[PDB]
């Protein structure tokens, strides 16, 4: 319930057959059918796995479907698999290198697939009998637990012990334990026992007491990326540093002996190696040393497929001095396959436009609708994308509930296009403050 | 300084020493600021920010407690909870080296494989030579009977915070300055001690205040 | 007694219920259609359906764009979040500047919990603890002036009392929902045991014991998401002195974010949060870089985005970090075009002279006709804000000569002894080493 | 399996004392590169000389960096070899200097033998053993430790210095325990709980790991691989304490620090005193620094300097640059963009563009090792399209060509995919014309 609706909420998935052929409408999507196909080619690509470090580029004008391609591609590779959505401006860090951040990005999007079985003695703790040696080296242990339906009683090690007395039960508190593991958690107090002692505490809390079979079968499936194992292992407690970002330049050395053993991993069988893609969206502002690294970081067996999207045409390249296509170099333009999206018509920006309108829960006239597709194709689509949602609140202070002619003519009138702002400030160019500092503040000459 | 001189069977020598600095603050500040009463909101605020929106709770987030227990082989999976609302000196103070299990992500990289062959090797070794390049500079270069060239020109104590009328706020500051568990910990326990607790009184040594 | 800060004459957009606005109402006067547009957008952000939404208000200095922001918060509400910023403040020493962006959109988005506060406070009459080397529960009694009552208390609690020192004959406080224990002091009825004493006397408390209330907590994101990314750890409840290490700002990762958010959506479900959405303004857009402007887009696409609001009052200027870029507004071309632009007009000599009244009014000042048609004059032919910021000399020059109105002398005196931006540019263009 | 733009190519198809041969190793052609790498390896592996630079120089997609890893994969898998990027040098923790420095000394490995004798097994008895006089004010005046193991086919009763009863306090150790005792320091560790303990206890911790095999008592020999910089960064830090410190530092960010020259020193004499006694053994390996072009003209200075030293590896440097002025200056002019000063100190290898032939050839061995079937047609025409465009952009479109025709149900890949393929997917020229012709900001 922490999810609004944003700008491309209705695209589900990318809208193919199982021939990779674009249908004209379906699953959010509508026209751009090579782009499509491509970004089909692409999804399989992914989703075959033997292939590693490949670098596609998206290039069209803006507001065309870049970002939604994008996303299309990123619902329709589905979850357990990594998907890094990075812009061109979060590389450039104060404590991290460009080549570091760049690295750190990489190895997000691969990860590996650990199996893992837990048998759970989940329940209510009734009575711990703890019974001594005369020596005390080791010491003997009755648990008795409870369920709503069932109770039993086990054997504790020693070990069990030195585990429980950590994280003290008190006879009441609902734990649970691992068989095949050790593994012990304290979840809390039950809701039974919530009227004894008057005043909670700080470390305390109440859950409910669990129901039905003590032992309990259920196995999980973990997706690591290398970057996780990266962290956890340049430190001595570096889960902080997962949750914080203070990870700080993690040797190579360490990279090197993680990627051996996730081999050697792969090798015996117990885990699996799941590729992923990340994508770079605007891509025309990185460093000329950030192509570079680029150029070079994908020749890794670890690499992922990585996607960049930009909407320039030739431009200067940062941290250079000429202009080159896409703002990128020839190199990198190399090692790329490019996708090109094309300009919409009417008819497509009149099926986009009646999907966000129905997306955002608006009801729209026909005529109202055909106004809005004119001015979606004299403007951008864009204003006109806006211009619904602002008109659904014109119509709803009116007292009606389907907007119509007027309250897209009053949404026009109240809000302003770039090109009828461009206008209003060239023809009032004084009341303005211009390249050189200067304004004319009075009113009177 | 500002201590407690004298203007001249055993006499007393308390440690009382101050700065000359003072800094006054009023009541009110401290009585709505940080300590809770029936009109301000510290200790629910606290819990709420600590306790119930705490993300390595697992009474509401078990399944990233458990991804962690897989990823780092803690045996417990209340630990996260624990290390991420203590301060970093009592984490520092208390750390023991509990076994952690095999099947986990966690490694031994050869640097602290070579670190850990070393610890008790003896001289005459390649690998414990290789390793101790700093106490051959020491001993060396004759590191124990040199002497010392500077000395600090004004010593002094942290700046003393006075409020005028409260007993809370001497308390606190006492217990911050003079905490027992930090000055346990950079200082010994005599040996006789030692003798009377573990023998005459019955305590362990695991129980023993780290020193 | 009262201050007055260029502003709180504004009380908000002062329109009907259909949404049109009168002449003058709420503070304002003119600018019918900035305030219209203003109060549909307000009627977006209390729809509570849609995220990043972007509205660029523009137009030329001393036009109302500022009043207009303080205005659409008015309308809002204190429930509400709202966070001013300029732009300027985006660049820190400590983290990139994204980053900081992103706690500026987070401390936007704000939850309502429903919370209840249960104290017990009084004089300790009895405090036994029993065991079974571990005690399983200590009995505490307490006496007010309305009685006394009788508790039962775990062990956490007793080692609580037990660390601020709580013997028999102290007043005391016991918070019941997170166990916090504070000493008031000693009560009076043991204030003769010794002639001099180091302890502090406090009297018994005069209501009950027990004590209940149900209170009302408003967070943000942001505070969940620096609560829960402390490296250094989690600090204590009372700390005049600092931390060893000094603990910086630090590049949070966007798992925490997805955990905080699983989090609040899962209290949320629950009935226990409340989620409402609220508004980002930034003034002087145009100070932001090229590289802020193209995180902007990004970051306008999340799902719990909040409503952004930029202002700007450039016309053709080139953007910072470029050479070869003009763009209207200071602003680039892609994001202008996810934007929706509202303007606002410059003011006649009638608008002048009633903002120049209401300002009078608001700073409890009483003038003439003749000085309000003399700074009427001088606002059309300086500045608006000169005028505003001339009214309280004219006030202290007619206190100095003991009236309780503004006259026209005083109106001349105050235009003698302080200049305008014009006159100080003409004694700066007519001199000879430097003014 | 996973390729990645290389892997069809292991080492550099030499024969013995003589010339190259076409086709051998993945390569289809550049003899002479082949040749003076060739030459190169003889030399690293001649294990005589110290830094000595090799910069080979030539057009884009050509075979450079496929000679770096041809190199590193003759030498094998023990010789050091570390792979680097122009770009990476500077960071914001330490001064690139010591970047450079660090990536040098990864580059030299050390080979050290060692005999450990160990005593391991489960624990049958463990019984501290009483004097003959006890001394008064005192309780367990122990004169020996006697300590029984139990492995398989095995079973051998130790007598033990007393003072190894507080290490076996320390490391709480009972019977039934699998223990690892070392000759000379004795330090016993517990390395778990014996298997046939298992399931005395229905909830239980303790590891339960198998019986040691072989003899309680074993010699072994073992041969332990290090570089210097791993000797750095072990000697630099410090070791097991108990201030606050070491355990204060260890729990934050490990933040890098310039390491003195001073270390280094005492590093390379104690490496050469054990080298002097025939226990070490020194193996210099390969530095690539790739793009050199990106470094600056005080990283090229530090080059010059540390190309002077006693143990420095061989370094190899790529680039791809013609005329073009060196970064951190503004008027000189200098070939491949290094400055003279560093030109001077090496030999440059150069790198040929490829033919018709040699890219049909290349396309058909990154064919099947991707394990893809092409046609006679399909492969003439990607060899067209490779001499028209790119080497690189035909290479790219062979796993497009095979999805394309395994959606059609086909194991061959014919002309209509490979056309399909190229409508689908542009190259830079295709794209740069689009942009031209365009006005839409496109
Ligand atoms: N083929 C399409 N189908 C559905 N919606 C589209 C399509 N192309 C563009 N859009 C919509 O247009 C809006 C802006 O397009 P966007 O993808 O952001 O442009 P760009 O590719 O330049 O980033 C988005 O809300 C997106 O949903
Ligand atoms: N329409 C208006 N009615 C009344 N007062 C106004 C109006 N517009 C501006 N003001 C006042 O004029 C002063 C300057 O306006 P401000 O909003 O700062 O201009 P800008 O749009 O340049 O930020 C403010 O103190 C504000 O209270
Ligand atoms: N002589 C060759 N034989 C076989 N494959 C080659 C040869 N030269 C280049 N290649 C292949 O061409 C691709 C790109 O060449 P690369 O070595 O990256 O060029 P550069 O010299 O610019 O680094 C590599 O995948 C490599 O396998």
């Known amino acids: ?445 | 300084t500002t201590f407690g001189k004298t203007t001249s069977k055993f006499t007393d020598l308390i440690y009382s020493s101050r700065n000359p600095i003072k800094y006054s603050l009023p009541r009110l500040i401290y009585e709505d600021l940080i300590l809770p009463n029936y009109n301000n909101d510290v200790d629910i605020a606290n819990k709420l920010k600590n306790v119930k929106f705490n993300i390595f709770n697992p009474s509401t987030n078990y399944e990233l407690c458990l991804f962690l227990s897989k990823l780092t082989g803690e045996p417990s999976l209340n630990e996260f909870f624990r290390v991420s609302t203590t301060p970093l000196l009592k984490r520092v103070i208390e750390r023991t080296n509990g076994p952690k299990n095999t099947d986990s992500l966690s490694f031994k990289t050869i640097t602290q494989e070579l670190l850990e062959v070393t610890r008790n090797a003896p001289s005459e070794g390649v690998m414990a030579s290789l390793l101790n390049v700093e106490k051959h500079a020491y001993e060396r270069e004759y590191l124990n009977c040199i002497q010392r060239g500077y000395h600090p020109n004004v010593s002094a104590p942290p700046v003393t915070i006075e409020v005028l009328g409260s007993s809370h706020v001497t308390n606190s500051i006492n217990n911050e300055l003079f905490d027992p568990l930090i000055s346990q910990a950079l200082s010994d326990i005599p040996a006789i001690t030692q003798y009377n607790m573990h023998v005459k009184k019955g305590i362990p040594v695991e129980d023993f205040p780290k020193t | 007694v009262t201050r007055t800060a260029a502003h709180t004459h504004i009380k908000g957009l002062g329109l009907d219920e259909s949404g049109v606005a009168k002449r003058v109402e709420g503070g304002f006067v003119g600018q019918i259609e900035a305030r219209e547009a203003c109060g549909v957008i307000v009627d977006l952000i209390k729809a509570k359906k849609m995220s990043g939404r972007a509205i660029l208000l523009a137009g030329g200095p001393s036009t109302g764009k500022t009043a207009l922001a303080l205005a659409i918060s008015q309308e809002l509400g204190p429930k509400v979040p709202f966070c001013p910023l300029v732009g300027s403040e985006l660049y820190s020493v400590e983290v990139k500047k994204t980053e900081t962006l992103m706690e500026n959109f987070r401390r936007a988005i704000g939850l309502r919990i429903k919370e209840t506060k249960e104290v017990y406070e009084g004089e300790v009459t009895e405090l036994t603890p029993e065991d079974a080397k571990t005690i399983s529960h200590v009995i505490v009694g307490l006496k007010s002036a309305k009685g006394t009552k009788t508790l039962r208390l775990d062990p956490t609690i007793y080692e609580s009392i037990q660390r601020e020192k709580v013997s028999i004959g102290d007043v005391i406080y016991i918070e019941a929902n997170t166990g916090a224990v504070k000493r008031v002091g000693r009560s009076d009825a043991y204030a003769t045991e010794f002639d001099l004493e180091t302890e502090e006397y406090v009297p018994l408390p005069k209501g009950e014991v027990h004590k209940k209330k149900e209170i009302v907590q408003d967070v943000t994101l942001h505070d969940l998401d620096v609560a829960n990314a402390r490296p250094q750890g989690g600090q204590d409840v009372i700390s005049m002195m600092g931390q060893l290490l000094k603990p910086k700002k630090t590049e949070i990762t966007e798992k925490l974010r997805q955990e905080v958010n699983k989090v609040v959506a899962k209290y949320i479900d629950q009935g226990v949060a409340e989620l409402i959405p609220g508004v980002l303004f930034i003034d002087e857009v145009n100070m932001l870089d090229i590289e802020i402007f193209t995180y902007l887009n990004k970051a306008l696409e999340s799902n719990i985005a909040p409503v952004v609001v930029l202002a700007s009052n450039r016309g053709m200027t080139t953007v910072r970090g470029t050479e070869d870029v003009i763009s209207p507004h200071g602003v680039p071309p892609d994001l202008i075009d996810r934007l929706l632009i509202v303007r606002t007009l410059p003011y006649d000599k009638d608008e002048i002279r009633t903002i120049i009244e209401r300002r009078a009014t608001v700073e409890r000042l009483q003038v003439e006709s003749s000085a309000l048609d003399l700074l009427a004059t001088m606002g059309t032919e300086t500045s608006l804000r000169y005028a505003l910021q001339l009214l309280a000399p004219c006030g202290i020059l007619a206190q100095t000569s003991n009236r309780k109105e503004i006259v026209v002398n005083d109106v001349n005196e105050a235009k003698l002894l302080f200049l305008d931006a014009k006159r100080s540019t003409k004694i700066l263009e007519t001199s000879a080493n430097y003014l």
């Open chain 1, 1 to 445: 319930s922490l999810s609004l609706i944003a700008a491309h909420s209705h695209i589900t998935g990318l809208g193919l057959d199982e021939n990779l052929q674009p249908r004209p409408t379906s699953e959010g999507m509508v026209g751009q059918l090579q782009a499509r196909r491509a970004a089909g080619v692409i999804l399989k690509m992914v989703q075959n796995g033997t292939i590693a470090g490949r670098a596609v580029l998206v290039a069209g004008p803006p507001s065309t479907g870049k970002t939604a391609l994008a996303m299309g591609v990123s619902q329709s590779l589905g979850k357990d698999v990594p998907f890094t959505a990075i812009a061109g401006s979060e590389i450039f860090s104060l404590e991290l290198s460009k080549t570091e951040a760049l690295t750190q990005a990489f190895r997000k999007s691969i990860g590996i697939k650990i199996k893992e079985e837990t048998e759970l003695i989940e329940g209510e703790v009734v009575e711990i009998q703890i019974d001594r040696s005369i020596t005390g080296g080791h010491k003997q242990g009755k648990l008795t637990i409870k369920t709503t339906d069932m109770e039993t009683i086990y054997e504790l090690g020693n070990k069990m012990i030195d585990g429980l007395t950590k994280e003290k039960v008190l006879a009441g508190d609902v734990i649970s334990i691992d068989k095949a593991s050790g593994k012990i958690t304290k979840l809390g107090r039950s809701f039974a026992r919530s009227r004894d002692y008057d005043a909670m505490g700080a470390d305390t809390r109440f859950v409910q007491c669990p129901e039905g079979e003590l032992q309990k079968r259920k196995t999980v499936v973990h997706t690591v990326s290398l970057h996780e194992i990266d962290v956890i292992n340049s430190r001595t407690q570096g889960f902080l540093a997962l949750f914080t970002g203070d990870t700080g330049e993690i040797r190579s050395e360490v990279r090197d002996q993680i990627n051996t053993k996730v081999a050697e991993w792969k090798e015996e069988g117990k885990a699996e190696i799941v590729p992923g893609v990340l994508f770079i969206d605007e891509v025309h502002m990185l460093d000329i040393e950030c192509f570079s690294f680029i150029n070079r970081a994908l020749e890794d067996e670890f690499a992922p497929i990585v996607m960049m999207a930009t909407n320039r045409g030739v431009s200067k390249t940062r941290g250079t001095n000429y202009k080159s296509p896409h703002g990128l170099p020839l190199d990198l333009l190399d090692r790329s396959i490019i996708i090109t999206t094309k300009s919409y018509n009417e008819q497509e920006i009149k099926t986009i436009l009646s999907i966000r309108a129905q997306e955002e829960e608006v009801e729209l006239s026909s005529d109202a609708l055909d106004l809005l597709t004119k001015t979606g194709v004299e403007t951008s689509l864009r204003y006109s994308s806006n211009l619904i949602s602002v008109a659904q609140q014109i119509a709803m202070k009116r007292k009606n509930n389907t907007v119509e002619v007027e309250d897209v003519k009053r949404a026009y009138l109240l809000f302003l296009d770039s090109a009828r702002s461009v206008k209003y400030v060239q023809e009032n160019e004084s009341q303005y403050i211009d390249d050189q500092g200067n304004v004319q503040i009075s009113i009177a000459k």
